[PDB]
Ligand binder design. Structure first.
Ligand SMILES: CCN(C(=O)c1cc(F)ccc1Oc1nncnc1N1CC2(CCN(CC3(C)CC3)CC2)C1)C(C)C
Length: 462
């Protein structure tokens, strides 16, 4: 049952209409997670899933076709959004047996709301596909990706008036927290390419990156809106994004930023900065300000145990040919990961470190050498930052149940070391933390790089 004020905004015919509807909803003490997620899913379906008009642009009279191409919007009728809203609420309300004396919900209650979402999904589909994140995908396709399940469970709880069930976010996983002050936890979805019903205590005690040693985000309803905005997927295919969905996500994040709802959301600040890098909004903070905001947010609220705030910043410096600053920010990234244990389900962050060490840094140093042929390659500080990055990775691996470094890592390490002349490398005096890097300190600074020896040393088991 949509309140009358919710009804007046429709029909949404523009991006701003969506923004006004988000603006209107964020003013309430509890914004409608189902209504908001349906609208974004409807908009994204007809902009990215079912692309109505092609995206290509043609090469004294007017041109026969729009010479720059076309953007469009699928009008969201009240009748159509409300019909879908009614389907979900009729589904959820008839499925759970509603005392909750303290405004808190039982573990067995959260479990059957979770079970109602879980058992509504198709048994076979590709969990990693795009555009199955929203309640629109749930109700019209019975398909949800991993964190989409957790979000749907949270939206179902708001539908049943369980103000105490909230979305919990690590950097790669989602679950629910509940109880008098968010102290119980329950897994509600799978992770990886499931532990449903269990707490996350074991994973927090595991010191795996997946559970951030307990320094994860406990969302309020306002950050749960920020999550579904971050979850907007503009990809039409791998080489094509929808300009409309990028613009919508960007204006929505600015709306959330102005209301203060990204203050505890480092990844969302980083997402906004990345959008701002491609499409600056006049009068707004530049991307670097926003990257440093996300880092300050991670330091303030999650005691500096997040990884992505630093790779956001490092990526921006890399794309802008700021070699010193990019190397320093990847060193700081490795400095956070070195206090984690590399565990079974941490493959996402491994993949990102792999790409940095074995693609991004090699490319950055090659770029710098083309200028050389002052410069970063002549700066011992830059070499020290490179070694600090590898030292953190080795410390991360040390004592973990999963190996990190393999022979391919050694190949790129030897290459990156070679980018610094021996006279530069011999100026550093470094204290390493990892046993692996200590066991080749002298081999890293020698005038002649011993590739086989460094390869042997980088690949010794932890
Ligand atoms: C990307 C889709 N998505 C997730 O995957 C997800 C799932 C979870 F259960 C928990 C955190 C999750 O991630 C995020 N949650 N909220 C805001 N934004 C997030 N993401 C940005 C992201 C990390 C940073 N890289 C960029 C680099 C490496 C440059 C810094 C891009 C991908 C992940 C969510 C938005 C639905």
């Amino acid at each position: 049952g949509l309140k009358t004020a919710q009804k007046t905004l429709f029909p949404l015919r523009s991006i701003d209409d969506v923004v006004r509807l988000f603006a209107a909803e964020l003013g309430r003490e509890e914004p409608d997670l189902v209504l908001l997620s349906l609208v974004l899913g409807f908009v994204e379906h007809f902009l990215a899933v079912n692309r109505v008009i092609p995206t290509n642009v043609p090469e004294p009279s007017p041109a026969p076709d729009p010479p720059g191409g076309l953007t469009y919007f699928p009008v969201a009728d009240l009748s159509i959004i409300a019909a879908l809203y009614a389907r979900f609420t009729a589904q959820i309300r008839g499925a759970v047996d509603l005392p909750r004396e303290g405004g808190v919900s039982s573990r067995e209650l959260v479990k059957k709301v979770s079970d109602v979402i879980w058992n509504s999904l198709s048994r076979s589909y590709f969990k990693d596909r795009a555009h199955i994140q929203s309640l629109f995908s749930f109700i019209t396709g019975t398909k949800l990706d991993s964190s989409g399940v957790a979000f749907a469970v949270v939206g179902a709880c708001q539908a049943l008036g369980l103000r105490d069930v909230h979305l919990a976010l690590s950097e790669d996983h989602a679950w629910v927290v509940f109880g008098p002050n968010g102290e119980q936890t329950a897994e509600v979805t799978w992770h990886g390419k499931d532990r449903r019903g269990q707490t996350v205590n074991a994973g927090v005690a595991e010191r795996s990156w997946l559970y951030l040693k307990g320094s994860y985000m406990r969302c309020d309803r306002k950050m749960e809106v920020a999550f579904m905005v971050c979850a907007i997927n503009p990809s039409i295919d791998l080489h094509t994004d929808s300009l409309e969905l990028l613009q919508l996500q960007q204006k929505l994040l600015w709306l959330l930023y102005d209301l203060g709802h990204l203050e505890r959301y480092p990844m969302a600040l980083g997402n906004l900065a990345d959008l701002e890098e491609l499409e600056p909004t006049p009068g707004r903070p530049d991307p670097l300000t926003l990257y440093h905001k996300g880092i300050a947010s991670a330091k303030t609220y999650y005691r500096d145990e997040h990884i992505y705030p630093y790779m956001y910043l490092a990526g921006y410096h890399c794309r802008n040919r700021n070699v010193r600053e990019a190397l320093q920010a990847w060193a700081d990234t490795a400095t956070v990961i070195q206090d984690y244990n590399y565990c079974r389900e941490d493959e996402e962050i491994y993949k990102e470190f792999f790409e940095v060490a074995n693609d991004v840094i090699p490319n950055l140093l090659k770029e710098a050498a083309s200028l050389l042929e002052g410069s970063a390659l002549q700066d011992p500080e830059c070499f020290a930052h490179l070694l600090r990055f590898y030292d953190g990775i080795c410390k991360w691996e040390e004592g973990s149940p999963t190996p990190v470094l393999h022979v391919g890592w050694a190949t790129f390490l030897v290459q990156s070391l070679g980018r610094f002349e021996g006279q530069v490398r011999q100026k550093v005096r470094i204290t390493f933390q990892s046993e692996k890097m200590k066991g080749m300190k002298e081999l890293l600074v020698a005038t002649k790089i011993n590739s086989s020896a460094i390869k042997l040393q980088l690949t010794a088991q932890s």
